[PDB]
Design a protein around this ligand. Sequence first.
Ligand SMILES: *[C@@H]1O[C@H](CO)[C@@H](O[C@@H]2O[C@H](CO)[C@@H](O[C@@H]3O[C@H](CO[C@H]4O[C@H](CO)[C@@H](O)[C@H](O)[C@@H]4O)[C@@H](O)[C@H](O[C@H]4O[C@H](CO)[C@@H](O)[C@H](O)[C@@H]4O)[C@@H]3O)[C@H](O)[C@H]2NC(C)=O)[C@H](O)[C@H]1NC(C)=O
Ligand SMILES: *[C@@H]1O[C@H](CO)[C@@H](O)[C@H](O)[C@H]1NC(C)=O
Ligand SMILES: *[C@@H]1O[C@H](CO)[C@@H](O)[C@H](O)[C@H]1NC(C)=O
Ligand SMILES: *[C@@H]1O[C@H](CO)[C@@H](O)[C@H](O)[C@H]1NC(C)=O
Ligand SMILES: *[C@@H]1O[C@H](CO)[C@@H](O)[C@H](O)[C@H]1NC(C)=O
Ligand SMILES: *[C@@H]1O[C@H](CO)[C@@H](O)[C@H](O)[C@H]1NC(C)=O
Ligand SMILES: *[C@@H]1O[C@H](CO)[C@@H](O)[C@H](O)[C@H]1NC(C)=O
Ligand SMILES: *[C@@H]1O[C@H](CO)[C@@H](O)[C@H](O)[C@H]1NC(C)=O
Ligand SMILES: *[C@@H]1O[C@H](CO)[C@@H](O)[C@H](O)[C@H]1NC(C)=O
Ligand SMILES: *[C@@H]1O[C@H](CO)[C@@H](O)[C@H](O)[C@H]1NC(C)=O
Lengths: 245, 251, 213, 213, 213, 220, 220, 220
Amino acid sequence: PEPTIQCGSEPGPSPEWMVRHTLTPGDLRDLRVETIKSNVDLEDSPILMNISWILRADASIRLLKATKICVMGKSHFQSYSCIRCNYTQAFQTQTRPSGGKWTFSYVGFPVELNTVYFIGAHNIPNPSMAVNFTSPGCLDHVMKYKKKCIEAGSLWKPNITACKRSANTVEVNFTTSPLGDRYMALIQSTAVIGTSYVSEKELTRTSVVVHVTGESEGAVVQLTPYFHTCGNDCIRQRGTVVQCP
Amino acid sequence: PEPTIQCGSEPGPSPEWMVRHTLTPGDLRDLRVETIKSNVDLEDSPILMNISWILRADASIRLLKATKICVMGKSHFQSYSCIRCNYTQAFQTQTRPSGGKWTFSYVGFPVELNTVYFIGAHNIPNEDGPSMAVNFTSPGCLDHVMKYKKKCIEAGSLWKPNITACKRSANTVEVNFTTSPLGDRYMALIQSTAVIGTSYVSEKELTRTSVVVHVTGESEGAVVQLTPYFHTCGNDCIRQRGTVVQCPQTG
Amino acid sequence: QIVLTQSPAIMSASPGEKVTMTCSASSSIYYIHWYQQKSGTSPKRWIYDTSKLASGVPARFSGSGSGTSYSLTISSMEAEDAATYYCQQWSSNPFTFGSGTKLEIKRTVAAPSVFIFPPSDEQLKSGTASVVCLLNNFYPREAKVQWKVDNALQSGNSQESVTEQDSKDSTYSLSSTLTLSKADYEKHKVYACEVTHQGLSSPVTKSFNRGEC
Amino acid sequence: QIVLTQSPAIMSASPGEKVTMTCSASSSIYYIHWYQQKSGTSPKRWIYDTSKLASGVPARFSGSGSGTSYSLTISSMEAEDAATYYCQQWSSNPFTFGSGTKLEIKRTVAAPSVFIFPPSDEQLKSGTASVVCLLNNFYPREAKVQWKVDNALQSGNSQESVTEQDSKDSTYSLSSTLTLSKADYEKHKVYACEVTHQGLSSPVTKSFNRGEC
Amino acid sequence: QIVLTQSPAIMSASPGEKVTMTCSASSSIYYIHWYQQKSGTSPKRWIYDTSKLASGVPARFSGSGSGTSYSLTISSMEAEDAATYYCQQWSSNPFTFGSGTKLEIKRTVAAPSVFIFPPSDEQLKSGTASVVCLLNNFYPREAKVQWKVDNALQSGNSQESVTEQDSKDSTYSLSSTLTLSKADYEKHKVYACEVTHQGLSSPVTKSFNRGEC
Amino acid sequence: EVQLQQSGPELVKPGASVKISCKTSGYTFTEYTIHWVKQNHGKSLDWIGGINPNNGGTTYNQEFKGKATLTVDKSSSTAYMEFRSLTSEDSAVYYCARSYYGYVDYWGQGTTLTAAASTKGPSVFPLAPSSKSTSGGTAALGCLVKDYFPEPVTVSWNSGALTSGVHTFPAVLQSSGLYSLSSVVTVPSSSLGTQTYICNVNHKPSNTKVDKKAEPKSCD
Amino acid sequence: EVQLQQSGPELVKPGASVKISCKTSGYTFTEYTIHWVKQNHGKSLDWIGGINPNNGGTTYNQEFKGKATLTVDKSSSTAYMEFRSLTSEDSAVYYCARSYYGYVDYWGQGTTLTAAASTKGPSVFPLAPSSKSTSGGTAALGCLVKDYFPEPVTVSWNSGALTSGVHTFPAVLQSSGLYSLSSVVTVPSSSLGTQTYICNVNHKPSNTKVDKKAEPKSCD
Amino acid sequence: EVQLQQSGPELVKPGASVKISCKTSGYTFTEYTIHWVKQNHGKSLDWIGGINPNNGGTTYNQEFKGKATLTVDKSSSTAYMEFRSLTSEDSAVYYCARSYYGYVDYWGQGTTLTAAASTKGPSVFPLAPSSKSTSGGTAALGCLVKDYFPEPVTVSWNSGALTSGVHTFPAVLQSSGLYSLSSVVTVPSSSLGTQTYICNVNHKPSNTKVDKKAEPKSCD
Ligand SMILES: *[C@@H]1O[C@H](CO)[C@@H](O[C@@H]2O[C@H](CO)[C@@H](O[C@@H]3O[C@H](CO[C@H]4O[C@H](CO)[C@@H](O)[C@H](O)[C@@H]4O)[C@@H](O)[C@H](O[C@H]4O[C@H](CO)[C@@H](O)[C@H](O)[C@@H]4O)[C@@H]3O)[C@H](O)[C@H]2NC(C)=O)[C@H](O)[C@H]1NC(C)=O
Ligand SMILES: *[C@@H]1O[C@H](CO)[C@@H](O)[C@H](O)[C@H]1NC(C)=O
Ligand SMILES: *[C@@H]1O[C@H](CO)[C@@H](O)[C@H](O)[C@H]1NC(C)=O
Ligand SMILES: *[C@@H]1O[C@H](CO)[C@@H](O)[C@H](O)[C@H]1NC(C)=O
Ligand SMILES: *[C@@H]1O[C@H](CO)[C@@H](O)[C@H](O)[C@H]1NC(C)=O
Ligand SMILES: *[C@@H]1O[C@H](CO)[C@@H](O)[C@H](O)[C@H]1NC(C)=O
Ligand SMILES: *[C@@H]1O[C@H](CO)[C@@H](O)[C@H](O)[C@H]1NC(C)=O
Ligand SMILES: *[C@@H]1O[C@H](CO)[C@@H](O)[C@H](O)[C@H]1NC(C)=O
Ligand SMILES: *[C@@H]1O[C@H](CO)[C@@H](O)[C@H](O)[C@H]1NC(C)=O
Ligand SMILES: *[C@@H]1O[C@H](CO)[C@@H](O)[C@H](O)[C@H]1NC(C)=O
């Protein structure tokens, strides 16, 4: 039979063992990470790492019994956990007879938004393997379905029409969200040239005129929503000012 | 492995053969120490040293009858913890018959948190400095096993404030964090190469709070340090760290 | 004294994929030569003098290397390529071969069809009962077979045998033979073969009751 | 440490001709990478991960190989491909580069136009005489330039300098500078530059008489 | 108390040949460490803990040993390897080094070019005459220089200095300086430097006559 | 055309010696080295040694020195190999081969040498199709070929007419020292009542041939 | 777009220290390792070492370990390489380059370092057009730019107003250690008596600018 | 990255005291032992002692005890070595080095200590190329740098522009107690009379700088 992995949690050593002060050769690509949706049937499924590693085909694989994996997330603060994957049998060939080299993967370590993750792994008996990745934010097509992103407006489709109306005045149309009632419309060319404020408790297509001080033809229009959970840091919507037929 | 060890309480040393050399020769490494939990079932289990050593593969091993081990606290402390491990029989081969080396271990010596330990060992009979020596700092409240000890828990070792800190103005940082049932008083600190800002917070509820820190320097990418003032730890409670970020974080 | 190490020892490739196999010499040689061997015939010279193709050998094959490191490459795998490939040197005495790369055909997963056979009456006259479980035309090769007698797991009384890849559909077949005394066979009623394979979501069990034709 | 031996060290190819150059590693590597460098500028990434083209690279370029043996191929040589190509690995520390393949563009033979320049009077004031002979717009690079002073063959007192291949017509130009003390120069009369080249049926000589006017 | 004995003190190795150097400890040690030093710079950690290579050290290097006996090995000598290698222990106080193995690179024999230089008039005015004989770019290092003054062999009035091996061509250069009083120097006419070297079939002599340019 | 024709197979008691021959034709015998190569069943190729027919000079793989002796006879353009004191580990195919440089360009067809202290023909039992649970589409049936020695047995079906769907498994060495294998075929279940299926088992070492008809067991 | 911008050429007295810089832009500095590479007049590429800007990890070619030191400055997105005791063996072009895996995808423009005590501007001599430098109606004339150190010199003609054939002979190292080059132009021969030709020679290392009128020889 | 930066060279009266420094950076100073190592002109390496910067504890090689004292200053992350009475036997290069376990993984660049009772700058004489030289052929020329103390002198040619073909020989201690060396270069004989060759000699201990033009000897 072929070896598989049985993985479990481990206390593990202090995260200093992960500080590579010599550079490892860059063409050693035996450790890979990618994010996967854990449940595909769900809109907001937990986001997990799929950590894959390749076992080098030489003498030493026959003595291998376990692989250790530790993950450190750095965003607004550090996180640090470790797993040990035990191989269920000893390795009879230095590559798998129905494939190429030996490759195994562990799915776990839920992924947070906007975090840089350091992943290191080492074989037992003996960071030898290392890979990092920075997780995307609420504009990523997969992460936008997270509750934190949706509640900050990641899926709001205001359908902005922003249009040069009269002498230096711009009419901005947009459809509100049920997530909040307060909005700010802004026009910016070489500098911010205009701002206005509308409050709308109704889910409707509202309209507002923003007074601009410079040329308002081809500048960006920026819509700011003020939803509860995101305070002053909700996802903003951008457009461009055009003429009105 | 035919020879075994029976270890006992002989003093018979001097905290001077441990400091025979001010510098101990750096390659005396056949002696290892690792901490082990006395009880698995318990979180606040006592922590012991597992002192293990390998014996030299040479003909003098035939003349070996005991290994002496002394542990010294070094904190203007003296030794007075030595054990003598007698080998039950003579050594017939210079290695085990299917063993890298002759290896033995002794578990004992209760360990304190954040403590520096010098451990020296000497074979009997036989030079007259330590045959083996190792320096050892015991883990602290951040270690994965020691964090569940009672003194660590009560100092906030398991507090998860989930700090979010955002550069608001050129001179202000907004720090959000979740309070602990262990206390009501907190100090938020922003530090780059020096401390650039401090704010104190009083909050009696278990809630997600917010505080503005006025800073005197560049705050982007600086460390945020949260000091809680929990009981039993006074001003020496476990600090929590984060990093200042540019908010909004999206496009 | 030169020894040649070949890697991988066994590998599979789908038609159309690129294939590489290596030959490593314990010290430097002037040339490496490669032979193809299919089950039941003589090896054939395939690539010689490191990079030359014998006449007729498809140009999707190529050889390269120097010093101690050589390789054989197939730009695009074909089913006719499934074979064992040996490298060989005669730059020093003794003439030596490598241990060989067995190249098999990768195909889509196929679950086995399982059959169980009670011992024949002819055999039972002799005192021994062979119970045969057959896993037919499956892929990949890896499969687990467990015997159960009156729902008791057996061990130590069975042997497995696996065919080579079928020439037409590239599948494997497997036999597991459970051998018992007639005495022990006539003591129990339900004989079961439980088969585990990647192509089955749950293990399939096939059984018979003794003497129920 | 890992040595990358590149062959050939120097080569030329006609436009439209197929070009192959090889990179041989002293021990095995996972990938090879190739950089292009033209005179006076930084190397540019050309082929990476053995067979992928850098941004801007025409697909007449391709890379292949594995283990210790790698190659770069140009399906149809273009004049803009003349450059030095370096292979490179970082499968083990240290990161190393190959020794380089200099690729020039071949063309039909073209004879040089030979020109001679006597020393300036301004230079003779300072005490030295540089006599300059020019070979203009020729191919191939190989040429013999022999100085003769009052029909006496010179040796050891001249230096040559050769241009890069012309961007439009791919020829070379060459200067030979004969340097003498003011004393030895004003001591002689006839200074001759003799040029031997494949594009000339007989060797050409250009001369001036010192002290003409 | 432990001391370390290294052998050989000096050796030269052909490019490509296997190199071993040994370190013997006066009593048993737990580890040996090796440092490389090239002329004019600090020693660098090379192999440590007996067999581990520092980052960047070529894998052609290995270390082994135990007890009182250790060695450093180069599987195939490269020119870059020429340097002095020291072993080192700190199993006992004092920390000690071995005396080093100076490893040089062998190349083909090359005879020196010999030059002789008379004393300058500026120096003679001060009362002393230095005559210098130069042996340039030779290999191997061994060479004999004999001074003759009006055919009288000199002794005790000359000093030699030898360069280190050139990094590029692996040759040596040597100066022999014969020093005389102005008084003795102006009594004689023929000052000769006679050179014996493996690359010369017959000894070479270079001479000048005093006060002739 | 170049041809290397080797002598026929030999079944031999352990401890005996044998000499097999390699008859060459189509080229000048003395101009090319002849090699000998051992191949155990299913395993790797081992060079035994080679001989220059011009001068009779030889070189051996030292694992075979003493055990093997190479000779030629120029008059017949024939090479010979003598293997002494055969053990069961010597049962294998043995090839002669021609080289000029370092590679082999022509191979003989192989000579099987089998070491056996005794021979024993097999018992052949039916693997009777589960006619009790017919339909579902395809039924399997077969022959169990038990307790023979040495290898090999040959199994055909219906005197060689039935090849499709036939799987004859590698022999397994039982702990009794004897071999066993099954040969199976899959057929439409509705063919169990209309078609005849006979397995023809041949064991040349013992001159035993066994034909066994495999029938659905009595169901009513 | 990604850019690696290196500091300018430097003359550095042997034994003094120098630190050259590599200013990065167009990407997240902490995401890519920075490498340094040497190219002397021998044109071969020598890797010096690399540094990861995120954590300061480094690895060297041992021929440069102890000789070069690599550092980073995150605020400016800048990498540095420092020689502590520059020697003449160190005169060369130095490149920085960015990697993610084992290959470098963006290169700096290079920094020329000269280890010497002084610079020396050129003497500019005329190569005067004459009948002995004329063929098919075109005359060749030029400027001999001799005895300068270190490289490079630049030559334009008539301050950039001149259209003409141009032949720039690369610098040649003289046995004094000084360089020499010729800059030659081809013009209509009938233009000699009417047009003036000035070669504008620039030697930045010595801050030298020289304009030289090249005049026809009077002997045709 | 870890760096050990040592103070510059020292001239010291025989019998006087001297203190050299070792500036560490790139790591936690108090965590690593600092060692000091001597290298004499015989090139053997002698350990002098080590110091624990955490507590100032020291161990000395007893072959040096009482001659040297090791100290640290934690605030500046610096180690110091003081010789109380430097003698001629003490002139040597001295290294600091950091240890991990029994080996030293980083070395300072070395500090030369010279016990000198006086300084004396050299006389510089021309080594004039010979008139009796081969047609073409190679000529040699040089500079004799005589009677200086202590080492070293530095020699360049043409202000550092001339490095190819240059051999500056190791200094030799004369029986007078003073040093002398030659620096030579080989050039084409046709360059004699066309090129200028100047040797630039510097002796920092005596603040002596001499430039010497070397020309063929004047016939008359
Ligand atoms: C984390 O990332 C790893 C890869 O790094 C993923 O592992 C892959 O998983 C997919 C399916 O999730 C596999 O795709 C399957 O390939 C089978 C063939 O197996 C051979 O060929 C592949 C190369 O293509 C080898 O990797 C493999 O080891 C074998 O050599 C197909 O037959 C599969 O289809 C089968 O399954 C479905 C039901 O699952 C049936 O309906 C089909 O009929 C058929 O039986 C499928 O195409 C892929 O092989 C895996 N690769 C590796 C390297 O393991 C993990 O899935 C991923 N983790 C998560 C949570 O997504
Ligand atoms: C792996 O093995 C280790 C050591 O035997 C053990 O502690 C751990 O529980 C095992 N983990 C799993 C998931 O089997
Ligand atoms: C966008 O707005 C226009 C005008 O208000 C409307 O006609 C159109 O249906 C809207 N489309 C979407 C996708 O919201
Ligand atoms: C914007 O809204 C105003 C007011 O309802 C309407 O008159 C105008 O047509 C709208 N324009 C677009 C582009 O939706
Ligand atoms: C901090 O909390 C306040 C109050 O809930 C909220 O307005 C603000 O957006 C929070 N900041 C962050 C970075 O979450
Ligand atoms: C070990 O031996 C010593 C001396 O023989 C004795 O004092 C001590 O009690 C012994 N200890 C044990 C545990 O046997
Ligand atoms: C332990 O610490 C002492 C004091 O600094 C030191 O001399 C010794 O070398 C250390 N041990 C090891 C193994 O480095
Ligand atoms: C102490 O450590 C050694 C070394 O790993 C180990 O073999 C031994 O079992 C440990 N002692 C215990 C677990 O009681
Ligand atoms: C921390 O709080 C932020 C903001 O409320 C939230 O988005 C995030 O999920 C929290 N993270 C953890 C680990 O609790
Ligand atoms: C992530 O890894 C890449 C590839 O090794 C490296 O270039 C990059 O600097 C790493 N990122 C961080 C933040 O360490």
